[PDB]
């Protein structure tokens, strides 16, 4: 299927793919921010914003995959394949979940337009080769 | 942690526990019905209703677990492990999706006002003993 | 002495005698349906309708007879007596509760106006001989 | 289930539990007062008040348990277990039924606010140790 | 090349894929029903609705393939080839016509507003597993 | 129980736990700041603000826990019990009491809104990679 989750809010998979993997916080850090900043809005039953609506489902999906990881880790009889599967889940699907949760959280915190502007700026920044790129990477804030 | 997927709508997990496991349709069935009725509803410039957003997220998540299954089929040479994992993905993670996708497609077709009443009526129906149980189960329409 | 539980509503004991004993659902079924649809209706700061008050009293009384059953299971070593008492609580005190809880949950879901008519229609249905009896018994909806 | 019957009317199981067991009248006395003061209101089909609505069901439940007690007393073949069961029902569930019926009857007679005030006062009174507690216990009346 | 016959109406090819192949009626049945209800609707001085035009085109096309079949029966002496061609015309080109003619006769009788909803409801019905599937399939009326 | 002491002031136990353990200052320097800055306000009979009452109760509680520890130290002859109890009072609950005192003291000095804003700011700053975050961390100010 040719479906893009971020295409609704102006963002796109091509636009976000420029971000290096090291940029995103760890998934546990994103779920820690989720609680600490929006535990009321997430648990409350109002349709606060489409960002919240997508974020709830994203968090639940990550919960399901975490349960899947524990299931393999505790149940599987082969330590080698056990580690293989847990490491496959924690990294490959990691990237995607850390990216989606980060985008939604950043939108809620900073404004959709602000996040899109920052992402365009970082797309410009990263593609420059090191020898001429500025030393300090772009920083995100609404001012 | 304990976010409830259906709470923000008019149904919940415990409320949706009424409907038996074998009642819900196959994920392939739901996917085909979606590709048939709503192929642009989940591709329009902007989302129209929270149901569309939730349905789209459901398609993404099920696509992720489908690609996981294909990857397992390709990579896990051990036939027993490959069979176990493919059975798990389709029998234990498949039911939850079946439920979510069904709740978000019936809502689009008929609306929450009709789906929530259907979920109450089906509980009433399934609760009666087989002696007095109407042979024809309730079905959605209009 | 001879207080009638349903008299203050639109049904009575003799009126509710129409519905067979095996028609009513299990107390566990009714309890689950309640925990699913009305979990705050029976916990809100103040009661909203007499149906809520009566349903809450019914839950308390059934909880009392459930704890009696568990206590009997724990304390009565004599297996025959333990079996007799557990059978009694669930077969002779269980039917009356099944009836009360059903009448107070269907009223909440659909209202007295629909429950009383359903109880008349079911009498009409059950009264006909099997030759002309419609195969599909009447069921509540909307 | 975490349900409290008296919580609707301001009363609570914690609030009423302070009352000593000897305080409540015998269950037969409560059912004698029921008739003598509210036989018309109980038998009449109007929803006079939520107190009446709860009281009708409470009386019917006690009737059912009385039938249960007679059933065991007359039918059971073992006199020892027969007496055991009848005494278990007449005392343990007694406390609860004598308490509930007493609360509803007192509310009907005296006013919900008056009963709550008296119950708070008796909660203060009973918790005081004997050496400093007043000799005469609080008395209930609307004045 | 890829013109869609139903796109200009409220249904499509993928949408009409829900209804099983054996559900649609025989071409003879549809032809007779047409000769019975609409014999002047497809012969009036001028067309009244696009449904009439499309139905008339369908009759012409099916007449062309009927005459092809009769010509094959007359001319192809080889019994095996004659049997193969007559089977093909009625089993592989016959289903597409059955579909088109049915969609254009039900639309005339009941209108698109009723046919499109019927096609969604039948998908919902057929999708449910046999365990909970209502024994009586949905049918058009009024 | 499930009472969060910060629940009233806006914060939560999880929100303050969103900072690392070692970040909070020790009880000693913290109480020295309290005494240096608001002793006259803490000793005054004026409940000028809820923070004053909460802090007043907190220091008294910590003192009660310190007196118990000292009594254990002087009374118990066993070195093992003495060491374990004096550590347990200091390390296991020291973090919680060090975070409770810090919240109130910072709230008084800079204002509650400043502390709430700083908590989220620093919690977000501690989780971003160093090469993509300002080298110097945030600090309270007015």
DSSP secondary structure of A7-55: GGGT--HHHHTTS-GGGSPPHHHHHHHHHHHHHHHHHS-S---HHHHHH
Size of the A and B interface in Cβ pairs below 8 Å: 60
Residue of C105, C129, C128, C124 lying closest to C49 (CA atoms): C105
What does each C-alpha distance from A22 to A18, B14, C16, C125, F24 come to in angstroms?
12, 40, 70, 71, 28
CA atoms within 13 A on the CB side of E103: 25
Distance (Å, rounded) from C-alpha C101 to C-alpha C104? 5
Long-range contacts of D121-130 (CB under 8 A, 24+ apart): D122/D18, D122/D19, D123/D15, D123/D18, D126/D18, D126/D19, D126/D20, D127/D18
Contacts of D123 (CB under 8 A, 6+ apart): D15, D18
Is B139 an interface residue toward C (CB < 8 Å)?
A: no
**Best mutation site among B132, B133, B137, B141 for testing chain C: the one with the most C CBs within 10 Å?**
B132
Distance (Å, rounded) from C-alpha F69 to C-alpha F76? 10
DSSP conformation class of D26: P
Between the two ends of chain C, the Cα-to-Cα distance in Å is 37
Residue of B8, B1, B3, B2 lying closest to B104 (CA atoms): B8
Instruction: For tokens 């006079």, name the residue.
Output: D48
Contact E124 B140 (CB under 8 A): yes
Residue of F42, F92, F39, F43 lying closest to F65 (CA atoms): F92
Q: Give C118→chain D minimum CA distance, Å.
A: 21
Is B130 an interface residue toward C (CB < 8 Å)?
A: no
Backbone angles phi, psi at A132, to 5 degrees: -120, -5
Looking at chain A, how many residues does it have?
A: 143
Q: Give B31→chain E minimum CA distance, Å.
A: 11
Long-range contacts of C34-37 (CB under 8 A, 24+ apart): C34/C59, C34/C101, C34/C105, C35/B14, C36/B12, C36/B14, C36/B15, C36/B17, C36/B18, C36/B123, C37/B15, C37/B120, C37/B123, C37/C105, C37/C108, C37/C109
Instruction: For tokens 């893009």, name the residue.
Output: A4
Residue of E45, E25, E14 lying closest to E105 (CA atoms): E25
What does each C-alpha distance from F73 to F26, F64, F79, F93 come to in angstroms?
21, 14, 9, 17
Distance (Å, rounded) from C-alpha C23 to C-alpha B134? 11
State the Cα angle at B84 between B78 and B85, rounded to 5°: 90
| CA F13 centroid distance within chain | 12
B22 within 8 A of E131, measured Cβ to Cβ: yes
E72 within 8 A of E82, measured Cβ to Cβ: yes
A50 within 8 A of A7, measured Cβ to Cβ: no
Instruction: For tokens 């629940």, name the residue.
Output: F7
Chain B residues with beta carbon closer than 8 angstroms to that of C29? 127
Contact C136 B132 (CB under 8 A): no
Instruction: For tokens 């005054």, name the residue.
Output: F44
Instruction: For tokens 């003879």, name the residue.
Output: E28
| CA C99 centroid distance within chain | 3
Is F132 an interface residue toward A (CB < 8 Å)?
A: yes
| CA B28 centroid distance within chain | 11
Contact E123 B23 (CB under 8 A): no
Residue of F138, B74, F129 lying closest to A137 (CA atoms): F129
Contacts of A16 (CB under 8 A, 6+ apart): A6, A99, A103, A119
Chain B residues with beta carbon closer than 8 angstroms to that of A42? 3
Is D50 an interface residue toward C (CB < 8 Å)?
A: yes
Contacts of B86 (CB under 8 A, 6+ apart): B69, B72, B73
Contact A60 B7 (CB under 8 A): no
Contact F127 A33 (CB under 8 A): yes
**Best mutation site among C99, C119, C141, C142 for testing chain B: the one with the most B CBs within 10 Å?**
C141
Neighbours of F101 (CB within 10 A): 23
Contact B23 E127 (CB under 8 A): no
C101 within 8 A of C55, measured Cβ to Cβ: yes
Long-range contacts of D110-117 (CB under 8 A, 24+ apart): D110/D140, D110/D141, D110/D142, D111/D142, D112/D9, D112/D10, D112/D51, D114/D140, D114/D142, D115/D11, D115/D140, D116/D9, D116/D10, D116/D11
Determined by cryo-EM
Residue of F98, F105, F121, F126 lying closest to F52 (CA atoms): F105
- Compute the radius of gyration of chain A from its Cα atoms: 17
Chain E residues with beta carbon closer than 8 angstroms to that of B109? 120, 124
Residue of A43, A98, D29 lying closest to B1 (CA atoms): A43
Q: Give C65→chain B minimum CA distance, Å.
A: 22
Per-state percent for chain F, helix, strand, coil, to nearest 5: 70, 0, 30
Residue of F73, F88, F39 lying closest to F59 (CA atoms): F39
User: What sign does the dihedral A28-A31-A37-A40 (CA atoms) show?
Assistant: negative
CA atoms within 13 A on the CB side of A136: 5
D19 within 8 A of D99, measured Cβ to Cβ: yes
Q: Give A35→chain F minimum CA distance, Å.
A: 8
Residue of A98, A73, A71, A92 lying closest to B75 (CA atoms): A92
B129 within 8 A of B25, measured Cβ to Cβ: no
User: What sign does the dihedral A80-A83-A84-A86 (CA atoms) show?
Assistant: positive
Distance (Å, rounded) from C-alpha B44 to C-alpha A118? 25
Contacts of A65 (CB under 8 A, 6+ apart): A89, A93, A97
By three-state DSSP, how is residue F126 classified? Answer: coil
Distance (Å, rounded) from C-alpha A23 to C-alpha A127? 15
Instruction: Using CB atoms, pick whichever of D3, D47, D81 lies closest to residue C42.
Output: D3
Token readout for D55 is 């009281």
Instruction: For tokens 């020790």, name the residue.
Output: F26
Size of the A and F interface in Cβ pairs below 8 Å: 32
**Residue of chain E minimizing CA distance to B139:** E134
Neighbours of D80 (CB within 10 A): 8
Distance (Å, rounded) from C-alpha F49 to C-alpha F38? 12
Residue of C59, C62, D4, C67 lying closest to D103 (CA atoms): D4
Distance (Å, rounded) from C-alpha F84 to C-alpha F92? 11
Q: Give B75→chain E minimum CA distance, Å.
A: 33
Residue of A19, A43, A38 lying closest to A96 (CA atoms): A19
F1 within 8 A of F105, measured Cβ to Cβ: no
Chain A residues with beta carbon closer than 8 angstroms to that of B59? 1, 3
User: What sign does the dihedral E126-E128-E131-E137 (CA atoms) show?
Assistant: negative
Distance (Å, rounded) from C-alpha C78 to C-alpha F120? 64
Q: Give D65→chain C minimum CA distance, Å.
A: 9
Distance (Å, rounded) from C-alpha E6 to C-alpha E26? 20
Distance (Å, rounded) from C-alpha B12 to C-alpha F49? 42
A21 CB burial (10 A radius; 0-12, 13-18, 19+)? exposed
Residue of C84, C46, C48, C58 lying closest to C6 (CA atoms): C58
Token readout for B9 is 């709508």
Chain B residues with beta carbon closer than 8 angstroms to that of A57? 5, 53-54, 57-58, 61
Contact A33 F123 (CB under 8 A): yes
Residue of B55, B42, B44 lying closest to B5 (CA atoms): B55
Distance (Å, rounded) from C-alpha C59 to C-alpha C42? 9
Contact B47 A43 (CB under 8 A): no
Token readout for E28 is 């003879």
What does each C-alpha distance from B7 to B12, B93, B122 come to in angstroms?
5, 20, 19
Instruction: Using CB atoms, pick whichever of A43, A54, A57 lies closest to residue B5.
Output: A57
Q: Is E75 left (phi over 0), alpha (psi -120 to 50) or beta?
A: alpha
E112 within 8 A of E10, measured Cβ to Cβ: yes
Is B36 an interface residue toward E (CB < 8 Å)?
A: yes
Identify how many contiguous H helices and E strands chain E contains and give both numbers.
5, 0
Q: Is C116 left (phi over 0), alpha (psi -120 to 50) or beta?
A: alpha
Chain F residues with beta carbon closer than 8 angstroms to that of A29? 127
**Residue of chain B minimizing CA distance to C33:** B123
Distance (Å, rounded) from C-alpha A87 to C-alpha A24? 18
List, as ranges, residues 77-106 from B with C-beta within 8 Å of E: 106
Token readout for D120 is 């708070």
Buried b (16+ CB within 10 A) or exposed e, E108-135: beeeeeebbbbbbbbbbbbbbeeebbee
Contact D96 C64 (CB under 8 A): yes
Chains touching A (3+ CB pairs < 8 Å): B, F
Distance (Å, rounded) from C-alpha F98 to C-alpha F115? 15
Size of the C and D interface in Cβ pairs below 8 Å: 60
Token readout for A18 is 């420029």
Instruction: For tokens 């492990």, name the residue.
Output: B81
What does each C-alpha distance from D35 to A116, C2, D39 come to in angstroms?
76, 11, 4
Distance (Å, rounded) from C-alpha E88 to C-alpha E69? 10
**Residue of chain E minimizing CA distance to B125:** E132
What does each C-alpha distance from A61 to B5, B24, B55 come to in angstroms?
10, 20, 13
Instruction: Using CB atoms, pick whichever of C25, C35, C109 lies closest to residue B120.
Output: C109
Q: Give B14→chain A minimum CA distance, Å.
A: 16
DSSP conformation class of A129: -
Residue of D69, D58, D52 lying closest to D31 (CA atoms): D58
């Amino acid at each position: 299927m040719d479906i893009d989750p971020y295409k609704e809010f102006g963002a796109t998979v091509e636009l976000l793919s420029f971000l290096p993997s090291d940029f995103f916080p760890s998934v546990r850090d994103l779920l820690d921010t989720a609680a600490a900043l929006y535990r009321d809005a997430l648990e409350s039953p109002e349709h606060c914003s489409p960002h919240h609506t997508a974020l709830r489902q994203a968090i639940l999906c990550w919960g399901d995959l975490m349960t899947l990881a524990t299931w393999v880790g505790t149940n599987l009889e082969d330590p080698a394949s056990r580690d293989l599967v847990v490491s496959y889940v924690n990294t490959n699907v990691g990237l995607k979940f850390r990216q989606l949760l980060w985008f939604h959280i950043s939108c809620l915190t900073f404004g959709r337009e602000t996040v899109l502007e920052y992402l365009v700026s970082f797309g410009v920044w990263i593609r420059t080769p090191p020898a001429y790129r500025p030393p300090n990477a772009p920083i995100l804030s609404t001012l």
